[PDB]
Ligand binder design. Structure first.
Ligand code: GGB
Length: 279
C-alpha cells in the first residue's frame, strides 16, 4: 500500500533515503496486534482512530486526555493518516495528569497493569507498549519496564530530551526494553535527543504531525514522538510474522537503515527504524 502526502516520519520509516513523502507498507497494517499507549490518555472519539482506540485504565478523575500528548503519540502508532500501524488496536492507560505529570509509583502501577491486562484483550499477533515518558534514574521504574517486557510485551520507551546520556533516565536506561532516540527530516539527530550506549534505535522525532485533542492535529517534537513510530513498527512487523515481542527491538535494529544519521556521538548506535517493505 502507498499513502501519498504522508507525514515525513512515516515516509522515512519506509525509505532508504530522506526527502520523500509517500509511506509504503503491507496492507495487513498491524491488524490483530495491540498497542498500549501509557501516557495522558487518548481521545478515542477522534475520527482518525476509526473506533480502534479505547481507554482501558486511568489513575485520575477522568480517562480523557486533557493534554493532547497521549493522543498525539497514539496517532503516530495507529491513526489512519498519521499512524505507522493503521489497523492495530490502541489501548490507553492514563498514568499522567492533564499537565503531563505523574508519580513514578503510578507509572509503575500502569506498567504492571498492562502486563496483566493483555490477558483480557484479543491480540493474536502480539502486544506492544509505548512509553513516551520518563524521569531521573530509578531502579524500580526500570524493573517495572523489564517485567512488562518479560511478560511478552514489546516495550518501547523514549530516550529523553536533555541532549544527555540516557543512562541517567528511566525507563530509558533499562537494558531489556527498546530505547528510542529522535531524528529530524534531514537525518540529523534531533537537537534535544538523548544519546548513549543504552539507545537501541532512532525514529522520527522533530516536527511530527499527528492527532490532537478536540478532533484536531498538530506538529510537535520529542523523543516522545519517535517512540510511537517504533512501537507502531513493532506491531506492524509482528502482524507480518517477521518477529515477536521478545525479539522485535533487536529485529528492528538488525533491519534498520545504518550509518545514515548525522551528529550521532561516538558510542551511540547509528540506526534508523525502517520497515524494509518492498512493493
Ligand atoms: N527494502 C528493500 N531492499 N526494497 O524495497 C524497496 C522499497 C519499496 N519502494 C517500498 O515500498 O518501500
Amino acid at each position: 500500500a502507498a499513502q501519498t502526502n504522508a507525514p515525513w516520519g512515516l515516509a522515512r520509516i519506509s525509505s532508504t533515503s530522506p526527502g520523500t513523502s509517500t509511506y509504503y507498507y503491507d496492507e495487513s497494517a498491524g491488524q490483530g496486534s495491540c498497542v498500549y499507549v501509557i501516557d495522558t490518555g487518548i481521545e478515542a472519539s477522534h475520527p482518525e482512530f476509526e473506533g480502534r482506540a479505547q481507554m482501558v485504565k486511568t489513575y485520575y478523575y477522568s480517562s480523557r486526555d486533557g493534554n493532547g500528548h497521549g493522543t498525539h503519540c497514539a496517532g503516530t502508532v495507529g491513526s489512519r493518516t498519521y499512524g505507522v500501524a493503521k489497523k492495530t488496536q490502541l489501548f490507553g492507560v492514563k498514568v499522567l495528569d492533564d499537565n503531563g505529570s505523574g508519580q513514578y509509583s503510578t507509572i509503575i502501577a500502569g506498567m504492571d497493569f498492562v502486563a496483566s491486562d493483555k490477558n483480557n484483550r484479543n491480540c493474536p499477533k502480539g502486544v506492544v507498549a509505548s512509553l513516551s515518558l520518563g524521569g531521573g534514574y530509578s531502579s524500580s521504574v526500570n524493573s517495572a519496564a523489564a517485567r512488562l517486557q518479560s511478560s511478552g510485551v514489546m516495550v518501547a520507551v523514549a530516550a529523553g530530551n536533555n541532549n544527555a546520556d540516557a543512562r541517567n533516565y528511566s525507563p530509558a536506561s533499562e537494558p531489556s526494553v527498546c530505547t528510542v532516540g529522535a531524528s529530524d527530516r534531514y537525518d540529523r539527530r534531533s537537537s534535544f535527543s538523548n544519546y548513549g550506549s543504552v539507545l537501541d534505535i532512532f525514529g522520527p522525532g522533530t516536527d511530527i504531525l499527528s492527532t490532537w485533542i478536540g478532533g484536531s492535529t498538530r506538529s510537535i517534537s520529542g523523543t516522545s514522538m519517535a517512540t510511537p513510530h517504533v512501537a507502531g513498527l513493532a506491531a506492524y512487523l509482528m502482524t507480518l510474522g517477521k518477529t515477536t515481542a521478545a525479539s522485535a527491538c533487536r529485529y528492528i535494529a538488525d533491519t534498520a537503515n545504518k550509518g545514515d544519521l548525522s551528529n550521532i556521538p561516538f558510542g551511540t548506535v547509528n540506526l534508523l527504524a525502517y520497515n524494509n517493505y518492498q512493493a
